[PDB]
């Protein structure tokens, strides 16, 4: 039944014929516009171009899909191709602050007559009867969805690898992730592809690819966008919070995906949405910054390019006039270990192993399978043989253990507590805004599977339910390279390992850098990624 | 151990006698004041004659401290004499929203050096360490907190009463419920103790002591407000929303209140709530509307009191240009069985059975403390036995089922998705707000205990976590009470045979309808309860 992955490969190998036909079909016709200079516009440029009417929306279409089916050939990270475009063009609003531009879909944001599978032999069956919310919106708006783009199996990784479609590559490196889960959008965007992306996170699945391919994304509060459509594999779990949000070439573009959804049609299709306008004054403010930082959490060691990062832009905030402040959040151990961990493994991983009966499991998804699906007094066995020697390990057996609803209510209280601690950590500084190392050169292939303490950086502010944005801000020069022999992390265990020899061999590899503000300020958080990408770049 | 009860009776009778000093201290050296019209003038006149300065802050602290004292010893309303006010009458800032208004809080809004007992013997050792956020706003904006009112036990009843400060009475009729949870602070503002107090309502809390007490009040959006220290006695629920709200003689306090609370200052003393200003511009306006209603829910029969009202209050609209609509929820059995019922009870009692232990459990509770302290197999046998005969009672039973967080997340999701339902029903009739039957006549003493049934009109809007709200239209006929002989239920269950007996001998006492619009849209909810309060009364 599974061997119909087969089936999922044909679909995908026709939609990149139908791609291919349709920019041959166009460049024959366009024989003397220029492509190169099409593709390297801003998008800010690129908006005011189309709405300007330099340019035909049809033009800027298909130089872009025909730019998508291009870096496709090398990364494999086109799905599909979402057919009922053209027909969007001939009837886009124009006065849609989005007007010309195509944008690229996360796999799980479903498309009307359109697969979301996750990865999934179970959701290969059943296209969608209607498009999201979010999508509903970014149409009525002017924009067109043109491709969705792959994913890992169960969104559950950080790298991106499938047994439905493939493995996704990184634009910038073949032996390379190009992160996850949202690891399409994020190799499509780099290289050129898109010019704007959705993608999802409630691990670090925006600020992954935005870090390991060298692009900006931000990941809003929880409730600031719609879920309205969204294909989970799992639905219900509410401590640690997933949200979707904008990837993109410049944090400028963010801020106009950002601005273009926060309208009336958004919070009148899905009201549990706090109706929230950009307030665009809070955004392109010039004032100065009280900024909070650290240079390291205490569970994963940075890297010296994350380091080397960090400090950099540390030194360019402060010559620029804002005040830089040592700021570590309270516990942290206890936030990933039991908070986070235990609030998305609170159901010993049963609704998510569901996804798996009768699936292959993908070598990037490492032995998380074999290791959910071992006897409840086995993994608390193992928890506690393990406790003396690698307490990391010890904790993540721990919380794969199975709860009860009394169990879970004391940890969603837990959380929200834990929430305003470090509300009265931040207030007790003065912050407005804080600055942390994203997690640093791209791991190698199939290795975010076997560095699960890795995702510690972001995990945090999922958890704490905090807007976070990655904007990149240099790249590995090869004395950054040459420090990775000379690691060893914080617990010398076996995550440990596999990150020593998943960053190495990464000259002239994106880092990036985590901007953070308090919930409901994505846009005090996206004036401090201008700030920041502005200074670096 | 409990037998410390006698520790707050003491307490109570101190408080009680500061304030009865404190009024003579005043009254005697400010002889020639009028109180009756000090009284019962209307808020808005009255903050309006306290910013001119026609009226001393002092002149109108000590007036209603004083009838305060006096409808207390007709109600048992009041717990404790908030003390650190005078010097809150002395710094109050001056361009505060409610510069001069006086504040009555229910029991579990915390306050500094005072006790938050839920009339529970576990809690009566120590007084809160801080002001809650709400209380800090209030002070923030020239509020004076001056008493706190009287809960029934663990707060999850509709009458009021506990073991440690004893019963409190409906100043109507001495022999009927002021409702509840908020039941002391229906009590107070009823009969003029006060121009104005908060509440909770996570069943209908806030709306049961306004109908039953005849005042107005409002449970806005789940999170428009925030709880951050709010005393409750189980922590961690978040299927089924608990919202804190308004309680007023008028809906035009509730919206000073409310505007008053969405302020710059609340959204930064926890910045967890969405920052929503109050919008004028939708409260004020004066556009028909397109209303749904429903006469009955199909589960809880309406006193003949109730149908009159609703239909009344249906014509009125009409006659006004305002277009009504019949709508009802979908699947109304599956969201309070279920839904509710199971969300509330989903750990089967073991969080909130351990308020208990070493404690009187009280006895307008009825035997709901004998019933969760049942073990697991005699639950489920009594739930098959009964469904051939009394399938509410079974269903009842059913719900204190202790689930896995597995089956916890399949319940949050449940909830999510018939949210999603609802609204997709209210927009395809293109409705703003909707016209629902409130639960009629008070009800006896020690009677909501074994009346459970009755909060179905209520608590379907906590599961939705839509806005709603309570507006007295009428009083009770002599017909009224006549046709409440004629009363059969739905199910003839013990639920239906107990509402009989306690809602009849009501002749004169006030019935009431609610009011409710789709989530954030408080302001307009505000609007149409505004025009029903203009037109019948
Ligand atoms: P994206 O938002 C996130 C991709 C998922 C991250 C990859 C692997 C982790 C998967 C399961 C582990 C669960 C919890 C561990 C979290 C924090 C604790 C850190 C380790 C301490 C034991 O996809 C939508
Ligand atoms: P207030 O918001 C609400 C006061 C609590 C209501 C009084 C008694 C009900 C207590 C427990 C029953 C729990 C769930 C039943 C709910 C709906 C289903 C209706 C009956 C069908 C079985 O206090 C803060």
New interface residues.
Partial sequence: ARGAATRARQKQRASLETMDKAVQRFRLQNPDLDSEALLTLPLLQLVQKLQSGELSPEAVFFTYLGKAWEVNKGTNCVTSYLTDCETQLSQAPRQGLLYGVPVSLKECFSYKGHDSTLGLSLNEGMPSESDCVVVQVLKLQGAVPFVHTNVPQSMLSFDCSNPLFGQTMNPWKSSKSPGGSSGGEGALIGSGGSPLGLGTDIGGSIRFPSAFCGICGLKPTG?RLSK?GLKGC?????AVQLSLGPMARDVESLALCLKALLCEHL?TLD??V???PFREEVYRSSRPLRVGYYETDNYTMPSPAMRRALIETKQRLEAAGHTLIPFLPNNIPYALEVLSAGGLF???G??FLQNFKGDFVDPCLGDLILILRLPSWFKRLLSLLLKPLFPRLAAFLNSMR?????????????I?MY??SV?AQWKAMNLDVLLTPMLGPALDLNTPGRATGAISYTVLYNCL?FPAGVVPVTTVTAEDDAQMELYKGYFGDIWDIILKKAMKNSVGLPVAVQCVA????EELCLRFMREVEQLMT
Same sequence: chains 1, 2.
């Fill in positions: 409730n309205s799992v639905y219900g779990q509410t919070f009201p549990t706090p109706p929230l609170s159901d010993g049963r609704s199975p709860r009860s609803a009394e169990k879970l209510w004391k940890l969603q209280h837990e929200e929430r305003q509300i339910d308090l919930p409901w300020q």
